[PDB]
Coordinates of C-alpha atoms and ligand atoms in Angstrom, one line a residue:
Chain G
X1006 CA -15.8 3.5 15.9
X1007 CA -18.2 3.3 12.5
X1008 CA -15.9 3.7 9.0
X1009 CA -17.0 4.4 5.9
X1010 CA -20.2 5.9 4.5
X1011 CA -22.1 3.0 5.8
X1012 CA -21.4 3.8 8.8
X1013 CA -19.8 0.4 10.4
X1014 CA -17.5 -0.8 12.8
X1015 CA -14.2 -2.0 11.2
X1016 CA -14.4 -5.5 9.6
X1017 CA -10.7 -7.2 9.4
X1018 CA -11.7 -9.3 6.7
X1019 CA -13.0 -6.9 4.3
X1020 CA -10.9 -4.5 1.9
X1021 CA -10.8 -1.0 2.7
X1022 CA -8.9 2.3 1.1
X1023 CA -7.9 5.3 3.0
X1024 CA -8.7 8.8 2.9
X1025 CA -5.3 10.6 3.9
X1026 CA -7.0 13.8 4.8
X1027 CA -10.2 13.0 7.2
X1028 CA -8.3 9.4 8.0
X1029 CA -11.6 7.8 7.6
X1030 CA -11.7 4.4 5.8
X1031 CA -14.0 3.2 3.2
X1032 CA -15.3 0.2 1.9
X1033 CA -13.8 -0.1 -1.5
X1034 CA -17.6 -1.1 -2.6
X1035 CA -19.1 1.5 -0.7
X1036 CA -17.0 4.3 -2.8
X1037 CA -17.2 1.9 -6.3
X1038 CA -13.6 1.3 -6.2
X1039 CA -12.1 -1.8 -7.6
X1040 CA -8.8 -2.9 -5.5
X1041 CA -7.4 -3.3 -9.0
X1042 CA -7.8 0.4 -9.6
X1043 CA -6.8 1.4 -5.7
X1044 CA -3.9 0.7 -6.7
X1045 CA -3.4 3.2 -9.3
X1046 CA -4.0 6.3 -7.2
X1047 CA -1.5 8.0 -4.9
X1048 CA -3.6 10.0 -2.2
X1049 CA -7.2 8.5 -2.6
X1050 CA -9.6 11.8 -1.5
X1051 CA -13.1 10.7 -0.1
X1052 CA -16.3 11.8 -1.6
X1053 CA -16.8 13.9 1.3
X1054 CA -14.0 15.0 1.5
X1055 CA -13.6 16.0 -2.0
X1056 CA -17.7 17.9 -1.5
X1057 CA -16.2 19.8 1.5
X1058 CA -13.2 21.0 -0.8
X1059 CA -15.1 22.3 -3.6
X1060 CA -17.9 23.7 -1.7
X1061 CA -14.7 25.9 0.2
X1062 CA -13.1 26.5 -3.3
X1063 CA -16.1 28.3 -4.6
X1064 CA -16.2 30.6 -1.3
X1065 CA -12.5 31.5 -1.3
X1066 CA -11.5 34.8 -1.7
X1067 CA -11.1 36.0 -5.1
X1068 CA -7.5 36.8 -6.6
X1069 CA -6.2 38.7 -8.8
X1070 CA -5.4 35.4 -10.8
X1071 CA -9.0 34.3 -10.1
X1072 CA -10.4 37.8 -12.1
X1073 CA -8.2 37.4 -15.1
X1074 CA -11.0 34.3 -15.6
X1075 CA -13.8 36.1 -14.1
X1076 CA -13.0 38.8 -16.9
X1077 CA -12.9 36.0 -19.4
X1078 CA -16.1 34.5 -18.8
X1079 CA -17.9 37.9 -18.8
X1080 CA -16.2 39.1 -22.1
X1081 CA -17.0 35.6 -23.6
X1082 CA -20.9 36.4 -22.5
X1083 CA -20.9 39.9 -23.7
X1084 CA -19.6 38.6 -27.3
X1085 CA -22.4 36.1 -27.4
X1086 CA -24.2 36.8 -31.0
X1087 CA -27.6 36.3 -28.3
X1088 CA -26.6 38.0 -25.6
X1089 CA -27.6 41.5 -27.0
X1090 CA -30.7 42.0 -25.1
X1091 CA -28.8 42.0 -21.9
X1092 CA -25.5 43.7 -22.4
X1093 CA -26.8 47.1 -20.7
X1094 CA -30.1 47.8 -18.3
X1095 CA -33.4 47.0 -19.8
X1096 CA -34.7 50.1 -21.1
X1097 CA -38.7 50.8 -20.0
X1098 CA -39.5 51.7 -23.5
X1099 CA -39.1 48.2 -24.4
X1100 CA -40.9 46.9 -21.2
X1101 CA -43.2 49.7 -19.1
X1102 CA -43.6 47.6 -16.2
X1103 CA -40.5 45.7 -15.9
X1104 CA -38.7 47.7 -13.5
X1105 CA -41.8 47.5 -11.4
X1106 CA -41.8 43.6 -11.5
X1107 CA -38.0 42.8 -11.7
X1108 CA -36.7 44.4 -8.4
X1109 CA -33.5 43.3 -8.4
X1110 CA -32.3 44.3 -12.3
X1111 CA -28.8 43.2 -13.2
X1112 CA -27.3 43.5 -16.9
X1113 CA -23.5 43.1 -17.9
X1114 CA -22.5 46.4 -18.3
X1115 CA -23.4 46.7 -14.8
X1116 CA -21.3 43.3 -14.1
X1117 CA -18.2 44.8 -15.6
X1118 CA -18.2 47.7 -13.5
X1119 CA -18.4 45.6 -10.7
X1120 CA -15.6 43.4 -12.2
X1121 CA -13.7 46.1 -12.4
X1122 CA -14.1 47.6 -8.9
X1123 CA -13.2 44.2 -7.8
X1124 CA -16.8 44.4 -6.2
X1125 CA -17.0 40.8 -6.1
X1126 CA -15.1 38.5 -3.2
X1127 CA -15.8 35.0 -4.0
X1128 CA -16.4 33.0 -7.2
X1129 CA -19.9 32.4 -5.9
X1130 CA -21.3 35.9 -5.9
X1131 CA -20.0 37.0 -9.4
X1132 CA -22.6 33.6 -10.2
X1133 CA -24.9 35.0 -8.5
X1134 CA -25.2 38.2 -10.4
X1135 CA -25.0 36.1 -13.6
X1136 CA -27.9 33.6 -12.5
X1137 CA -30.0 37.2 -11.9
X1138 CA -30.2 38.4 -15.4
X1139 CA -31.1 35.0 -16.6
X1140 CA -33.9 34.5 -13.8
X1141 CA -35.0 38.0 -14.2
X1142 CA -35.4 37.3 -17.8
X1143 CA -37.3 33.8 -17.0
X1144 CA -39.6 35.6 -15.0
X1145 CA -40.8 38.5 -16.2
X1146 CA -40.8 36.7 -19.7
X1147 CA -43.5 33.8 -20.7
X1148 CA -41.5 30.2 -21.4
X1149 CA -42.6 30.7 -25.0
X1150 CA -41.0 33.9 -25.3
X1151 CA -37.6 34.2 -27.5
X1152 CA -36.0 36.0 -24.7
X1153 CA -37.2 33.6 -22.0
X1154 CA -35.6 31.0 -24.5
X1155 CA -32.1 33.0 -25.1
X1156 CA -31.6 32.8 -21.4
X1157 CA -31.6 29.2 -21.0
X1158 CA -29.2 29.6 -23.8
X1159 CA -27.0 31.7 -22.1
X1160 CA -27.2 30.0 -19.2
X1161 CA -25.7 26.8 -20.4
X1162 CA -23.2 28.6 -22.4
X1163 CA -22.2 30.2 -18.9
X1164 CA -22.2 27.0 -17.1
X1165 CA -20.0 26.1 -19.5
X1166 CA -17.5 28.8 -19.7
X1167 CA -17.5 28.4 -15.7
X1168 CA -16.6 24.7 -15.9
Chain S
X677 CA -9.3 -19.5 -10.6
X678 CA -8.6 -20.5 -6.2
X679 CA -6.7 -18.6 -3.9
X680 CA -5.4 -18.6 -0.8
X681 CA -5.1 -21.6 1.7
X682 CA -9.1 -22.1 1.5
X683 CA -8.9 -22.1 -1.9
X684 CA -11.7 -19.9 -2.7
X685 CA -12.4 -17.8 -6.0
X686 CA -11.2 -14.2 -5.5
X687 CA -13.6 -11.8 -3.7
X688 CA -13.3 -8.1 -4.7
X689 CA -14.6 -7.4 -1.0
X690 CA -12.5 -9.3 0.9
X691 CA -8.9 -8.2 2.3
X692 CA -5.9 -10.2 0.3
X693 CA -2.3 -9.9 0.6
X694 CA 0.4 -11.3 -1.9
X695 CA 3.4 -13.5 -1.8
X696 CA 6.6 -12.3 -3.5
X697 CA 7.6 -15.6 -4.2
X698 CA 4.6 -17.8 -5.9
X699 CA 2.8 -14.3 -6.7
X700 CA -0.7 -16.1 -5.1
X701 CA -3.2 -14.2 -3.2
X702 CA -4.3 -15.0 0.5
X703 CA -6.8 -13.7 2.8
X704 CA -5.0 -11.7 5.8
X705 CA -6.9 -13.7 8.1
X706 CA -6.0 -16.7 6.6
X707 CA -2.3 -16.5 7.0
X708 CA -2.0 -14.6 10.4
X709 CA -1.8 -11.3 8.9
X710 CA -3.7 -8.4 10.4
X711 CA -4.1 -5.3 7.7
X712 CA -2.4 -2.7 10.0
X713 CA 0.4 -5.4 9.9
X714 CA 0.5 -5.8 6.4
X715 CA 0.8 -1.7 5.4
X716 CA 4.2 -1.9 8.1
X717 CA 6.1 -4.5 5.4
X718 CA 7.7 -4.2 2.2
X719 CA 7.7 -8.0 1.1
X720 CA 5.8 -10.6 1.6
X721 CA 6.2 -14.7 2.1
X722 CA 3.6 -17.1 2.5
X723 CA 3.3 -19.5 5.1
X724 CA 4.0 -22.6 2.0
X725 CA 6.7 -20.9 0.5
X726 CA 8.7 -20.1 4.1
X727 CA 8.3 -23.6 4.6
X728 CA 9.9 -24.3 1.7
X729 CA 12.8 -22.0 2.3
X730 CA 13.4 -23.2 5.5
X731 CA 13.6 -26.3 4.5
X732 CA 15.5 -25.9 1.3
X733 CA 18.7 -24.0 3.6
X734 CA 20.4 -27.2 4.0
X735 CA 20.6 -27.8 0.0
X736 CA 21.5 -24.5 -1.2
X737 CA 24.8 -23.5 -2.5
X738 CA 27.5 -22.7 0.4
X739 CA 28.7 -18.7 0.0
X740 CA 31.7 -17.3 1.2
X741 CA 29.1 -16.1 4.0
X742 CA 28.0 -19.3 5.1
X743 CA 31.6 -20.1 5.1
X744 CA 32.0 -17.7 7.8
X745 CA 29.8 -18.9 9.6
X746 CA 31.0 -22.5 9.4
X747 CA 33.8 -21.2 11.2
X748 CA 31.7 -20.0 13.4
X749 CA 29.9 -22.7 14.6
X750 CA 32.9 -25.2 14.1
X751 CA 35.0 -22.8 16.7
X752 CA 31.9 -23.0 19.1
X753 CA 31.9 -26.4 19.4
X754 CA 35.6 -26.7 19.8
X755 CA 35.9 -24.5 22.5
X756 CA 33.1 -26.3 24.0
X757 CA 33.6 -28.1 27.2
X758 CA 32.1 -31.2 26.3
X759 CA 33.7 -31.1 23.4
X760 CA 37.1 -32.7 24.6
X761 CA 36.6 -36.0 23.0
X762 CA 36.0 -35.1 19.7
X763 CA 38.9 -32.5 18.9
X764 CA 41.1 -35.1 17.0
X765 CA 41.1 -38.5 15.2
X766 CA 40.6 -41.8 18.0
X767 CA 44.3 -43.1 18.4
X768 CA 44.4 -46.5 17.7
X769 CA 46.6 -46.9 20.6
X770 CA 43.8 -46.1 22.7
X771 CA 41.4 -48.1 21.4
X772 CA 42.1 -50.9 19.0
X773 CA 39.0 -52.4 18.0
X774 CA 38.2 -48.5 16.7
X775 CA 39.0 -48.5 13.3
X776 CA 37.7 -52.1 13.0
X777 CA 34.1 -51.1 14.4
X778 CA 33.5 -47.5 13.2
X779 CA 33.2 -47.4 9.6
X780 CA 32.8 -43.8 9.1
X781 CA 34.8 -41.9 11.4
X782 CA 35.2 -38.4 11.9
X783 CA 36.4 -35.7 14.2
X784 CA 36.8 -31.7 14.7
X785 CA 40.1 -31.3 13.4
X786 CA 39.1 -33.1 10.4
X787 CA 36.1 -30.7 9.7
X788 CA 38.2 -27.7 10.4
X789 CA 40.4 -29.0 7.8
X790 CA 37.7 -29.6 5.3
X791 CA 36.6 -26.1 5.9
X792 CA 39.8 -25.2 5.0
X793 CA 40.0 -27.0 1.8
X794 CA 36.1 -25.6 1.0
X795 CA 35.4 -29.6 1.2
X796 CA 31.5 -28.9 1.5
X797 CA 29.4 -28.0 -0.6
X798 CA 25.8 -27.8 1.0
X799 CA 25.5 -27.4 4.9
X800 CA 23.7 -30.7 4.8
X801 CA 27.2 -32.1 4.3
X802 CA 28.9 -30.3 6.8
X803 CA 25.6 -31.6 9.4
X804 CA 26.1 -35.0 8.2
X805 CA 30.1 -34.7 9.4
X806 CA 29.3 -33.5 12.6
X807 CA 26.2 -35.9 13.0
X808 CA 29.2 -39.0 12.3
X809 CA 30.8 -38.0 15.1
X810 CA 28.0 -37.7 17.7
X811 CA 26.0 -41.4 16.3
X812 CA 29.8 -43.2 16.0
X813 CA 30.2 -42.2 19.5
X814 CA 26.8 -43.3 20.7
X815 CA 27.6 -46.5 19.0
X816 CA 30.6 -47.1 20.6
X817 CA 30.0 -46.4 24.2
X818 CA 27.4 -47.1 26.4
X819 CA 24.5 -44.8 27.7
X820 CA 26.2 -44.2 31.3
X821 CA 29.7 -43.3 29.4
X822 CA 30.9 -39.6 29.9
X823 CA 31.9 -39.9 26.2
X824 CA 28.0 -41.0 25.5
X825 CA 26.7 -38.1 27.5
X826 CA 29.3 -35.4 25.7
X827 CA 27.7 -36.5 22.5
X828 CA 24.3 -35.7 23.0
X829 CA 24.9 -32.8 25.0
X830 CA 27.2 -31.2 22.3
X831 CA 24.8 -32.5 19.5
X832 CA 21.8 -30.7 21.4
X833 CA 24.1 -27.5 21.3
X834 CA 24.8 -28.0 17.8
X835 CA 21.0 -27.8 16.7
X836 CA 20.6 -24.4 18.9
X837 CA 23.9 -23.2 17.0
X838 CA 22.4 -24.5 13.7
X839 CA 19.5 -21.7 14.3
X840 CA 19.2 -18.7 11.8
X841 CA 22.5 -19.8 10.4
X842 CA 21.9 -18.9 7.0
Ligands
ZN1213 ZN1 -19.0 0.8 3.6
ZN1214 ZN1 -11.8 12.0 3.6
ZN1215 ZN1 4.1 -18.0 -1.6
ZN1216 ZN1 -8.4 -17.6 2.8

């Protein structure tokens, strides 16, 4: 029987705090948690424990709810004062050869209809479209380019709005 | 600062558990405590600070409780077959030289009475009464006397009756 993240067999002597959840016990140094401050939590939730959660929150199914805030965050990055250049498809007169270099185009006029067929089924996908117009950007754009520059922008502001 | 029984400084690694009474910390090793015990119990008394309740019972105020029990225990021992002896005052008649020999004496009826009258104040009064009446016995007659052999044999019962009396 090894406990904790270290992996070990259970030591009588030493102080450990419980994760409710996995029933795993961990070393309250192992975790950086002071017995003085074990005290002040109700149901201590291991780091793994807590990884596994979030990973699954991100991949549940989407609700109803959960789109009033997808709609949000899309509305807040089609506002954006720099987020012009990607509100609808890039349009070859501005860029020749970008369609045949950027195969997998995205744009957030595109992202709304999507938003509003309910095209997207977990948090993680609607990113995922997102992420695309930014790395499309990035790479058909030089790192000293404006636009390659707005992106990163963007992209922060997003992370953001998503947090 | 030291805790615990080893007196050691305090060791944020190390498994403690803490007495209600002098609020000190001890290792659960230390004092005989395993942690799965330890999570099954409310309160907490350390090994110094029983011994210091069990040692202070016979000093403590008597309650209306303990008077209860006094009862108790006093209707035990009269109803105890070795007991005979001691259920009233010596009659002079009987033995002459008593009163003359035994300065303290002291019977069963007497305690009941003092009992009665709330007399005691601490149980190591009402043990001292009932400890006059086994030693002025012992004085008195020999080793090989059935009164002598009542005495200790009630006295030993007395002790075992004593137990987890308050
Ligand atoms: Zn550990
Ligand atoms: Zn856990
Ligand atoms: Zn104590
Ligand atoms: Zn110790």
């Amino acid at each position: 029987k090894l406990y904790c993240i270290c992996k070990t067999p259970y030591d009588e002597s030493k102080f450990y705090i419980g994760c409710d959840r996995c029933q795993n016990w961990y070393h309250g140094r192992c975790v950086g948690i002071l017995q003085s401050e074990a005290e002040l939590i109700d149901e201590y939730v291991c780091p793994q424990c807590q990884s596994t959660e979030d990973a699954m929150t991100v991949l549940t199914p989407l609700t109803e709810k959960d789109y009033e805030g997808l709609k949000r965050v899309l509305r807040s990055l089609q506002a954006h004062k720099m987020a012009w250049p990607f509100l609808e498809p890039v349009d070859p007169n501005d860029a020749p050869d970008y369609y045949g270099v950027i195969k997998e185009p995205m744009d957030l006029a595109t992202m709304e209809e999507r938003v509003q067929r309910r095209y997207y089924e977990k948090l993680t996908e609607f990113v995922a479209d997102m992420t695309k117009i930014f790395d499309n950007c990035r790479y058909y754009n030089p790192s000293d380019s404006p636009f390659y520059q707005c992106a990163e922008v963007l992209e922060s502001f997003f992370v953001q709005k998503l947090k």
